[PDB]
Design an enzyme around this catalytic site. Structure first.
Site, PDB file in Angstrom:
ATOM      1  N   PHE A 121     -48.251  -0.486  15.228  1.00 28.30           N
ATOM      2  CA  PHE A 121     -48.535  -1.743  15.528  1.00 28.30           C
ATOM      3  C   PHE A 121     -50.028  -1.639  15.206  1.00 28.30           C
ATOM      4  O   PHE A 121     -51.195  -0.987  16.354  1.00 28.30           O
ATOM      5  CB  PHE A 121     -48.224  -2.205  16.341  1.00 28.30           C
ATOM      6  N   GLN A 242     -52.102 -16.636  22.907  1.00 26.24           N
ATOM      7  CA  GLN A 242     -51.517 -15.340  21.613  1.00 26.24           C
ATOM      8  C   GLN A 242     -52.144 -16.374  21.068  1.00 26.24           C
ATOM      9  O   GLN A 242     -51.398 -17.220  20.431  1.00 26.24           O
ATOM     10  CB  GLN A 242     -50.733 -14.485  22.480  1.00 26.24           C
ATOM     11  N   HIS A 244     -51.502 -15.250  16.729  1.00 27.75           N
ATOM     12  CA  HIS A 244     -50.695 -14.475  15.311  1.00 27.75           C
ATOM     13  C   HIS A 244     -51.993 -14.356  14.674  1.00 27.75           C
ATOM     14  O   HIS A 244     -51.931 -15.601  14.189  1.00 27.75           O
ATOM     15  CB  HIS A 244     -49.643 -14.144  14.601  1.00 27.75           C
ATOM     16  N   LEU A 254     -43.558 -16.937  11.144  1.00 21.65           N
ATOM     17  CA  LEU A 254     -44.438 -15.617  11.537  1.00 21.65           C
ATOM     18  C   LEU A 254     -44.186 -14.620  10.154  1.00 21.65           C
ATOM     19  O   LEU A 254     -42.860 -14.604   9.358  1.00 21.65           O
ATOM     20  CB  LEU A 254     -44.223 -15.456  12.481  1.00 21.65           C
ATOM     21  N   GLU A 257     -46.666  -8.770  12.097  1.00 21.90           N
ATOM     22  CA  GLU A 257     -47.700  -7.540  12.175  1.00 21.90           C
ATOM     23  C   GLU A 257     -47.537  -6.181  11.385  1.00 21.90           C
ATOM     24  O   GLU A 257     -48.410  -5.529  11.568  1.00 21.90           O
ATOM     25  CB  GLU A 257     -48.643  -7.176  13.392  1.00 21.90           C
ATOM     26  N   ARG A 288     -54.713  -8.604  18.878  1.00 25.08           N
ATOM     27  CA  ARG A 288     -54.701  -9.611  17.945  1.00 25.08           C
ATOM     28  C   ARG A 288     -55.861 -11.066  17.933  1.00 25.08           C
ATOM     29  O   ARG A 288     -55.722 -11.620  17.878  1.00 25.08           O
ATOM     30  CB  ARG A 288     -53.156 -10.385  17.871  1.00 25.08           C
ATOM     31  N   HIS A 355     -48.679 -18.602  19.002  1.00 22.33           N
ATOM     32  CA  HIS A 355     -47.547 -17.084  19.450  1.00 22.33           C
ATOM     33  C   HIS A 355     -46.820 -16.741  20.070  1.00 22.33           C
ATOM     34  O   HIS A 355     -46.090 -16.692  20.544  1.00 22.33           O
ATOM     35  CB  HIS A 355     -47.593 -15.673  18.334  1.00 22.33           C
ATOM     36  N   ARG A 399     -51.903  -9.589  24.846  1.00 24.77           N
ATOM     37  CA  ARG A 399     -50.775  -8.635  24.282  1.00 24.77           C
ATOM     38  C   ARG A 399     -51.198  -7.641  23.169  1.00 24.77           C
ATOM     39  O   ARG A 399     -51.004  -8.616  21.884  1.00 24.77           O
ATOM     40  CB  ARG A 399     -49.366  -9.818  24.465  1.00 24.77           C
TER      41      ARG A 399
HETATM   42  C1  LIG Z   1     -41.547 -15.456  15.355  1.00 25.97           C
HETATM   43  C2  LIG Z   1     -41.971 -14.701  16.443  1.00 25.97           C
HETATM   44  C3  LIG Z   1     -41.617 -13.275  16.034  1.00 25.97           C
HETATM   45  C4  LIG Z   1     -42.044 -12.314  17.478  1.00 25.97           C
HETATM   46  N1  LIG Z   1     -41.515 -10.795  17.093  1.00 25.97           N
HETATM   47  C5  LIG Z   1     -41.974 -10.579  18.150  1.00 25.97           C
HETATM   48  C6  LIG Z   1     -42.081  -8.750  18.110  1.00 25.97           C
HETATM   49  O1  LIG Z   1     -41.570  -8.447  16.788  1.00 25.97           O
HETATM   50  N2  LIG Z   1     -41.981  -7.667  18.893  1.00 25.97           N
HETATM   51  C7  LIG Z   1     -42.257  -7.974  20.033  1.00 25.97           C
HETATM   52  O2  LIG Z   1     -42.117  -7.623  20.894  1.00 25.97           O
HETATM   53  N3  LIG Z   1     -42.666  -9.667  20.690  1.00 25.97           N
HETATM   54  C8  LIG Z   1     -42.490 -10.875  19.382  1.00 25.97           C
HETATM   55  N4  LIG Z   1     -42.616 -11.681  19.586  1.00 25.97           N
HETATM   56  C9  LIG Z   1     -42.333 -12.475  20.933  1.00 25.97           C
HETATM   57  C10 LIG Z   1     -41.581 -12.558  21.543  1.00 25.97           C
HETATM   58  O3  LIG Z   1     -40.097 -12.209  21.023  1.00 25.97           O
HETATM   59  C11 LIG Z   1     -40.793 -13.450  23.083  1.00 25.97           C
HETATM   60  O4  LIG Z   1     -42.106 -13.777  23.668  1.00 25.97           O
HETATM   61  C12 LIG Z   1     -39.524 -13.385  23.508  1.00 25.97           C
HETATM   62  O5  LIG Z   1     -38.985 -12.958  23.325  1.00 25.97           O
HETATM   63  C13 LIG Z   1     -39.575 -14.324  24.578  1.00 25.97           C
HETATM   64  O6  LIG Z   1     -37.400 -13.890  25.041  1.00 25.97           O
HETATM   65  P1  LIG Z   1     -37.473 -14.547  26.448  1.00 25.97           P
HETATM   66  O7  LIG Z   1     -36.197 -14.263  27.193  1.00 25.97           O
HETATM   67  O8  LIG Z   1     -38.660 -15.031  27.249  1.00 25.97           O
HETATM   68  O9  LIG Z   1     -36.883 -16.395  26.031  1.00 25.97           O
HETATM   69  P2  LIG Z   1     -36.733 -16.688  24.757  1.00 25.97           P
HETATM   70  O10 LIG Z   1     -36.116 -15.951  24.037  1.00 25.97           O
HETATM   71  O11 LIG Z   1     -37.893 -17.529  24.417  1.00 25.97           O
HETATM   72  O12 LIG Z   1     -35.378 -17.449  25.438  1.00 25.97           O
HETATM   73  C14 LIG Z   1     -35.286 -18.793  26.111  1.00 25.97           C
HETATM   74  C15 LIG Z   1     -34.408 -19.292  26.497  1.00 25.97           C
HETATM   75  O13 LIG Z   1     -34.642 -19.946  27.711  1.00 25.97           O
HETATM   76  C16 LIG Z   1     -33.402 -20.849  28.009  1.00 25.97           C
HETATM   77  N5  LIG Z   1     -33.948 -21.944  28.541  1.00 25.97           N
HETATM   78  C17 LIG Z   1     -35.482 -22.809  28.285  1.00 25.97           C
HETATM   79  N6  LIG Z   1     -35.530 -23.589  28.897  1.00 25.97           N
HETATM   80  C18 LIG Z   1     -34.128 -24.262  29.039  1.00 25.97           C
HETATM   81  C19 LIG Z   1     -33.099 -25.458  30.225  1.00 25.97           C
HETATM   82  N7  LIG Z   1     -34.496 -25.903  30.711  1.00 25.97           N
HETATM   83  N8  LIG Z   1     -32.782 -25.017  30.675  1.00 25.97           N
HETATM   84  C20 LIG Z   1     -31.836 -24.453  30.489  1.00 25.97           C
HETATM   85  N9  LIG Z   1     -31.850 -22.603  29.293  1.00 25.97           N
HETATM   86  C21 LIG Z   1     -33.231 -22.659  28.814  1.00 25.97           C
HETATM   87  C22 LIG Z   1     -32.746 -20.815  26.615  1.00 25.97           C
HETATM   88  O14 LIG Z   1     -31.623 -21.580  26.455  1.00 25.97           O
HETATM   89  C23 LIG Z   1     -33.313 -19.580  25.597  1.00 25.97           C
HETATM   90  O15 LIG Z   1     -31.932 -18.322  25.886  1.00 25.97           O
HETATM   91  C24 LIG Z   1     -42.356 -13.203  18.954  1.00 25.97           C
HETATM   92  C25 LIG Z   1     -42.016 -14.135  18.799  1.00 25.97           C
HETATM   93  C26 LIG Z   1     -42.079 -14.835  18.308  1.00 25.97           C
HETATM   94  C27 LIG Z   1     -41.989 -16.753  18.378  1.00 25.97           C
HETATM   95  O1  LIG Z   2     -45.541 -10.230  18.980  1.00 24.64           O
HETATM   96  C1  LIG Z   2     -45.487  -9.424  18.812  1.00 24.64           C
HETATM   97  O2  LIG Z   2     -45.125  -8.325  19.337  1.00 24.64           O
HETATM   98  C2  LIG Z   2     -45.629  -8.809  17.004  1.00 24.64           C
HETATM   99  C3  LIG Z   2     -45.118 -10.095  16.124  1.00 24.64           C
HETATM  100  O3  LIG Z   2     -44.603 -11.234  16.038  1.00 24.64           O
HETATM  101  C4  LIG Z   2     -44.978  -9.187  14.873  1.00 24.64           C
HETATM  102  O4  LIG Z   2     -44.168  -8.942  13.950  1.00 24.64           O
HETATM  103  O5  LIG Z   2     -46.446  -9.669  14.473  1.00 24.64           O
END
Ligand SMILES: Cc1cc2nc3c(=O)[nH]c(=O)nc-3n(C[C@H](O)[C@H](O)[C@H](O)COP(=O)(O)OP(=O)(O)OC[C@H]3O[C@@H](n4cnc5c(N)ncnc54)[C@H](O)[C@@H]3O)c2cc1C
Ligand SMILES: O=C([O-])CC(=O)C(=O)O
Ligand SMILES: CCCCCCCCCCCCCCCCCC(=O)OC[C@H](COP(=O)(O)OCCN)OC(=O)CCCCCCCCCCCCCCCCC
Ligand code: HEM
Ligand SMILES: CCCCCCCCCCCO[C@@H]1O[C@H](CO)[C@@H](O[C@H]2O[C@H](CO)[C@@H](O)[C@H](O)[C@H]2O)[C@H](O)[C@H]1O
Ligand SMILES: COc1[nH]c(=O)c(C(=O)[C@@H](C)C[C@H](C)[C@@H](Cl)CCl)c(O)c1OC
Ligand code: SF4
Ligand code: F3S
Ligand code: FES
Ligand SMILES: [K+]
EC number: 1.3.5.1
Lengths: 612, 102, 240, 139
Positions: A121, A242, A244, A254, A257, A288, A355, A399
């Site tokens: 990665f 960030q 992506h 997305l 990567e 990134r 992203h 990140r």
């Molecule tokens: C397309 C994509 C791919 C990614 N791939 C990777 C990866 O491969 N590896 C990596 O390390 N990271 C990756 N990331 C980044 C990472 O996945 C996210 O930043 C992370 O999963 C966010 O998780 P979280 O639990 O903080 O919130 P989220 O998983 O975004 O969930 C937010 C939660 O908050 C709750 N919530 C929000 N507002 C309220 C409210 N007002 N009242 C009640 N509940 C609320 C919602 O119900 C939801 O369940 C990716 C991000 C994206 C967008």
């Molecule tokens: O955000 C990450 O950590 C990884 C990610 O979205 C990707 O797979 O490109």
């Protein structure tokens, strides 16, 4: 008076059911805490499910690894704006965190020896940066987050956590600087619920929806980030967004990567793998912030692809088809659906896309929300945060890929561990005022019966288009100030809002108006923090201040150097406040934590030059 | 039996395979052995088959009890009338041939 | 030069006293809209009628929120192409035979509860060494999970099954049944016989008569019908 | 805090006493050939069983033997076309149910579950039913 108000009492309440909220939720129930979980979505609909690339940990399944090398890559990746005590905890706990997930049943891809498959990665190395590309991104093909979130949700069914699904958290219940809980709205029946608890954990994800094009889901509206802002508390480093590199052209979905981690390369209009010129060593696997800038420069300089010269190509068809089907089955299907591309024949049209938010709610390495009073870090009693909503800050100014999913499970567990050692279950829950949180219900009913000039959808677009042009990959003080004047005018024009759905049961018109309020609070702190920061650090790239300004000049020997005072350099966190009534943004600054948890076990990395 | 549902599912398929083999048996070796085997298989396969339709479409404690009892009467009378036809009349195999000689 | 497309959408408002279900038509200019049906629903909500309520999130077919009945079939509105034939009006209904909370929003809590009932998590007879080492699984035994773990719990398959229409209170449905099979053949699980024993009743599993509506409608291209057939073969073979 | 069985109970208790409508199903769902053939396999099975039961009841309640009723129909001197239509209408549901029953038994072994194979096996059952019913009625 008009809305029926239900009251609850728990030991701790967790706001969010993503990867971070779930780990903290049943982690607290693991420790005997009567814990409630409030989430506006069904847990497996959270943006975590869309995660693809994987999760980092120095397991050593592909080669001999060392978590301290992962520590070094993260400190360097953060551009020395990240807190090294939190990075220490995350990178050291990464092997145990991933082994825990696999032990939960997470269906990781496997090696010949039956261990967890790890891919390369961006911006990760061996031997403290002098040993070449590392392979420590543990993954489930390219559906890692999907399997991570479904595994955590399945595991959470074994414990006594009280779930409140499709509940919208309105604000925090603050009394005398302490958090007593959160007030929420039940979407199913339209009732207001006040949750009282001795400890509140905020894991509400990011706010990528402040921009026009973003890989984030429609529900990534930074709801928890705004609750902290409305409580008179600061947010940290919100101007570091960030971008992506490979977000698919058009739909903005997305493209992982992991495509580059398996061998994919970036191609411009003239067929050049241009990353061999920007990063001669890392090439397409640079950080990134570097790749997103590299791709953006090629477009505006006239070497863009497509009929508008507005994107580039991600080439995978040189990779064997069996590898593409095994390692990247998800983006293979997605590239066909949202672009008609067959990854075995034609490249994927990609361009930088919003992203992830490095900033958020400032915590420490234990997950406790902190505020800055006269130069010392005051822990807010009863308030916690983890995930993308929080700022450990393990990511600083940029990140590394596959570090967020790690952040989620490490600091979700850390919040539960910190509460268990600080408090006991069954302790008397704190009281609240009889009219506690009524300002949330008044603001809720105001938006419900809105009858003005501008609709909610029209206001959200003026915010997204303003952020997209004035706070893109490159920013200038003249352009940022123009965006600051626009956003501060859009915020004052929220008084002229206009809603239609006069109901309360599943009133998405009303909910998406509250999310617009939360998006605007986060967007102001972002563009005002970016306008004030007069340097170029990580993702935040100022073309009027192309340099990175630390307390010293780490490009020259420190022999007898004049140390810049804290008020003159920039290696410091941005702390943003917002007067919700007027919209004015206030900015403060707190120092970066350069110390680790044990210097004899993990040497603190001083700031150095940052190249790939 | 703790595996009563799976053992019943297997028996349904076993009787269908048996009933399937009785069609070439009735054409190639008509007589009493196939007539009575057809009598037993047509009743048992039809009884289990109509039971699935009741399980799928009939709801309520009393309607389910009323339907399953009325089905048990139908099956028992059907098997007896088929055995009566085989013993006192031409039998299943010969009746089919006479009907097709029309 | 506009391409106007007609959509007919189910509408019901629980807050209107005495509200009755109905259909409302919207005219969407396809030259100013995305290619997917969800892009039209969001365009309708942001421009024509902001009271139209529906579930959405990932808009890329990974989260499973926008499951609905479009042109007579259960699919994800975010990966279902808008029919460019302007002479045909697209009819959009919620998931079939489900209680309607509002407009296109069904009640999935029984669906969720059935999924909980099969205990969808790894179980070992000895869980003392939990979190110490990674469980070994060969590439071959991991491959057996392909086509199963990808399920996004959209509920399109179960809400298309007639047996789930008439007996959804007791029939688990293809979505939950396939997830049960996903844990039955997970090599790291030690409770295979207990998972099979749970289905020893006339309804939980044996209401499936191989109608195969589930496999036809799955937006992920999975085959829950085949998975049920593998369960049935396992139910008839395992010893105690 | 609530078991799965408890959640299912509140679901029914909440919804059945509510003013919530039931989303339409059979009136709006698009049909297909495998689905039409599934319910046809059920209708033919039920029709065949009821035909057997009406026959067994006739053997217990009618005052004449089977050869008598065959002689009565033969004395009516019916046309070969009506005899053919009767034979075809009698043997069509049996033939369809048999071929589609073998198709079901193949499924129970776990074979032929790819959706394109479901369509293929169905069409094969349809042409085998027609060919078998046409040849049998011609006898
Ligand atoms: C397309 C994509 C791919 C990614 N791939 C990777 C990866 O491969 N590896 C990596 O390390 N990271 C990756 N990331 C980044 C990472 O996945 C996210 O930043 C992370 O999963 C966010 O998780 P979280 O639990 O903080 O919130 P989220 O998983 O975004 O969930 C937010 C939660 O908050 C709750 N919530 C929000 N507002 C309220 C409210 N007002 N009242 C009640 N509940 C609320 C919602 O119900 C939801 O369940 C990716 C991000 C994206 C967008
Ligand atoms: O955000 C990450 O950590 C990884 C990610 O979205 C990707 O797979 O490109
Ligand atoms: C009744 C509906 C199905 C009818 C199938 C007709 C099959 C048939 O016609 O078999 C004839 C066979 C004698 O054949 P053969 O001596 O060659 O004479 C041919 C000229 N009539 O006659 C026989 O000797 C074989 C009779 C076969 C009996 C099949 C029993 C089926 C039971 C289920 C019926 C459900 C209604
Ligand atoms: C003479 C026959 C009669 C009276 C008869 C009757 C029935 C009935 C009433 C059903 C129930 C339908 C349903 O459950 O949907 C059924 C199902 C079935 N029949 Fe027959 N049948 C006959 C011949 C055959 C033959 C020759 C085969 C081979 C066969 C195979 C099957 C199978 C496999 C089923 C199960 C259908 C399912 O599981 O959905 N039948 N039959
Ligand atoms: C006794 C005889 C049995 C009953 C016969 C009933 C005949 C009519 C049944 C209804 C057929 O209805 C029609 O079926 C075909 C075949 O599945 C469907 O076809 C659909 O699926 C197939 C693949 O499975 C696709 O190739 C095709 O593009 C699609 O439209 C079509 O959407 C539906 O409109
Ligand atoms: C083989 O079992 C079955 N196969 C089916 O195709 C099936 C169906 O397709 C149903 C939609 C048929 C429906 C009841 C008709 Cl009679 C209304 Cl016009 C159905 O209900 C069924 O029983 C559970
Ligand atoms: S099997 Fe397919 S249709 Fe059914 S829940 Fe899973 S993804 Fe959705
Ligand atoms: S449609 Fe239903 S009957 Fe079985 S094969 Fe699929 S679960
Ligand atoms: S919104 Fe996630 S599936 Fe359509
Ligand atoms: K963050």
């Amino acid at each position: 008076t008009q809305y029926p108000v239900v009251d609850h009492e728990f030991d701790a309440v967790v706001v969010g059911a993503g990867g971070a909220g779930l780990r903290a939720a049943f982690g607290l129930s693991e420790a005997g805490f009567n814990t409630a979980c409030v989430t506006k979505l069904f847990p497996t609909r959270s943006h975590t499910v869309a995660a693809q690339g994987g999760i980092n940990a120095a397991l050593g399944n592909m080669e001999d690894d060392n978590w301290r090398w992962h520590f070094y890559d993260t400190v360097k990746g953060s551009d020395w704006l990240g807190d090294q005590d939190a990075i220490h905890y995350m990178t050291e706990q990464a092997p145990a965190a991933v082994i825990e997930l696999e032990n939960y049943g997470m269906p990781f891809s496997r090696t010949e020896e039956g261990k967890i498959y790890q891919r390369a990665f961006g911006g990760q190395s061996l031997q403290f940066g002098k040993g070449g590309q590392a392979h420590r991104c543990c993954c489930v093909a390219d559906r890692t987050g999907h399997s991570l979130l479904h595994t955590l949700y399945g595991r959470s069914l074994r414990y006594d956590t009280s779930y409140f699904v499709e509940y919208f958290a309105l604000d925090l219940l603050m009394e005398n600087g302490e958090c007593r809980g959160v007030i929420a709205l039940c979407i199913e029946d339209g009732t207001i619920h006040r949750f009282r608890a001795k400890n509140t954990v905020i894991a509400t994800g990011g706010y990528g929806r402040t921009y026009f094009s973003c890989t984030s889901a429609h529900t990534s509206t930074g709801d928890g980030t705004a609750m902290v802002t409305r409580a008179g508390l600061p947010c940290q480093d919100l101007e570091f967004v960030q971008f992506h590199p490979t977000g698919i052209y058009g739909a903005g979905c997305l493209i992982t990567e992991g495509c580059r981690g398996e061998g994919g390369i970036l191609i411009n209009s003239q067929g050049e793998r241009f990353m061999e010129r920007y990063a001669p060593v890392a090439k397409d696997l640079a950080s990134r912030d570097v790749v997103s800038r590299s791709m953006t420069i090629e477009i505006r300089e006239g070497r863009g692809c497509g009929p508008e010269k507005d994107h580039v190509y991600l080439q995978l068809h040189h990779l064997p088809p069996q590898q593409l089907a095994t390692r990247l089955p998800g983006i293979s299907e997605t590239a066909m659906i949202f672009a008609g591309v067959d990854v075995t024949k034609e490249p994927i049209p990609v361009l930088p896309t919003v992203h992830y938010n490095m900033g958020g709610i400032p915590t420490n390495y234990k997950g406790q929300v902190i505020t800055h009073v006269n130069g010392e870090d005051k822990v807010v009693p009863g308030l916690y945060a983890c995930g993308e909503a929080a700022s450990a800050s393990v990511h600083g100014a940029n990140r590394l890929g596959a570090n967020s999913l790690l952040d989620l499970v490490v600091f979700g567990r850390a919040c539960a561990l910190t509460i268990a050692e600080t408090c006991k279950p069954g302790e008397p829950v704190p009281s609240i005022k009889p009219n506690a949180g009524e300002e949330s219900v008044a603001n809720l009913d105001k938006l419900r019966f809105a009858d003005g000039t501008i609709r909610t959808s029209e206001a959200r677009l003026n915010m997204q288009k303003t952020m997209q042009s004035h706070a893109a990959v490159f920013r200038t003080g003249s352009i940022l100030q123009e965006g600051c004047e626009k956003l501060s005018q859009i915020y004052r024009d929220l008084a002229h809002l206009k809603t239609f759905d006069r109901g309360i049961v599943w009133n998405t018109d009303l909910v998406e108006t509250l999310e617009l309020q939360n998006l605007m609070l986060c967007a102001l702190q972002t563009i005002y923090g970016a306008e004030a920061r007069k340097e170029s650090r990580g993702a935040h790239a100022r073309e009027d201040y192309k340099l990175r300004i630390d307390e010293f000049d780490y490009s020259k020997p420190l022999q007898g150097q004049q140390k810049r005072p804290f008020e003159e350099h920039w290696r410091k966190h941005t702390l943003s406040y917002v007067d919700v009534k007027s919209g004015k943004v206030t900015l403060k600054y707190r120092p970066v934590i350069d110390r680790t948890l044990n210097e004899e076990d993990c040497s603190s990395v001083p700031p150095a030059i940052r190249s790939y | 039996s703790s595996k009563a549902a799976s053992l019943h599912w297997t028996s349904e398929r076993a009787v269908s395979a048996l009933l399937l083999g009785l069609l070439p048996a009735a054409y190639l070796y008509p007589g009493p052995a196939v007539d009575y085997s057809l009598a037993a298989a047509l009743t048992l396969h039809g009884h289990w088959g109509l039971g699935q339709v009741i399980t799928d479409y009939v709801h309520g404690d009393t309607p389910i009890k009323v339907a399953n009892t009325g089905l048990y009467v139908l099956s028992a009378i059907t098997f007896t009338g088929l055995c009566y036809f085989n013993y006192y009349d031409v039998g299943i195999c010969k009746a089919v041939a006479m009907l097709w000689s029309i | 030069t506009s391409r106007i497309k007609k959509f007919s959408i189910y509408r019901w408002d629980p807050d209107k006293p005495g509200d009755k279900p109905r259909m409302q038509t919207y005219e969407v200019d396809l030259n100013k809209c995305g290619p997917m049906v969800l892009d039209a629903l969001i365009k309708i909500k942001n421009e024509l009628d902001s009271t139209l309520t529906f579930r959405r999130s990932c808009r890329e077919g990974i989260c499973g929120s926008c499951a609905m009945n479009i042109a007579g079939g259960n699919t994800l509105a975010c990966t279902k192409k808008i029919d460019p034939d302007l002479s045909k009006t697209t009819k959009i209904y919620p998931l079939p035979h489900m209680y309607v909370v509002k407009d296109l929003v069904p009640d999935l809590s029984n669906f969720y509860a059935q999924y909980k009932s099969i205990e969808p998590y790894l179980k070992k007879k000895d869980e003392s060494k939990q979190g110490k080492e990674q469980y070994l699984q060969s590439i071959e035994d991991r491959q057996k999970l392909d086509g199963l773990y990808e399920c996004i719990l959209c509920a399109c398959c179960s809400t298309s099954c007639p047996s789930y229409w008439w007996n959804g209170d007791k029939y688990l449905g293809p979505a939950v049944l396939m997830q049960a099979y996903r844990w039955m053949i997970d090599s790291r699980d030690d409770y295979t016989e207990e998972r099979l024993a749970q289905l020893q009743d006339p309804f939980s599993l044996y209401r499936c008569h191989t109608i195969m509506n589930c496999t036809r409608t799955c937006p992920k291209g999975l085959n829950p019908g085949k998975a049920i057939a593998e369960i049935k073969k396992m139910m008839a073979t395992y010893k105690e | 805090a609530t078991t799965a069985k408890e959640e299912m109970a509140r679901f029914w208790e909440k919804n059945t006493k509510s003013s919530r409508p039931l989303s339409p199903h059979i009136s709006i769902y698009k049909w297909s050939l495998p689905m039409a053939m599934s319910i046809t396999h059920r209708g033919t099975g039920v029709a065949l069983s009821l035909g057997v039961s009406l026959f067994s009841l006739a053997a217990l309640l009618l005052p004449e033997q089977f050869p008598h009723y065959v002689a009565v129909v033969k004395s009516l001197s019916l046309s070969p076309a009506l005899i053919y239509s009767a034979k075809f209408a009698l043997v069509f549901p049996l033939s369809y149910h048999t071929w589609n029953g073998i198709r079901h038994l193949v499924w129970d072994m776990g074979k032929g579950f790819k959706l394109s194979q479901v369509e293929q096996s169905g069409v094969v059952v349809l042409i085998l039913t027609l060919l078998s019913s046409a040849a049998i009625a011609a006898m």
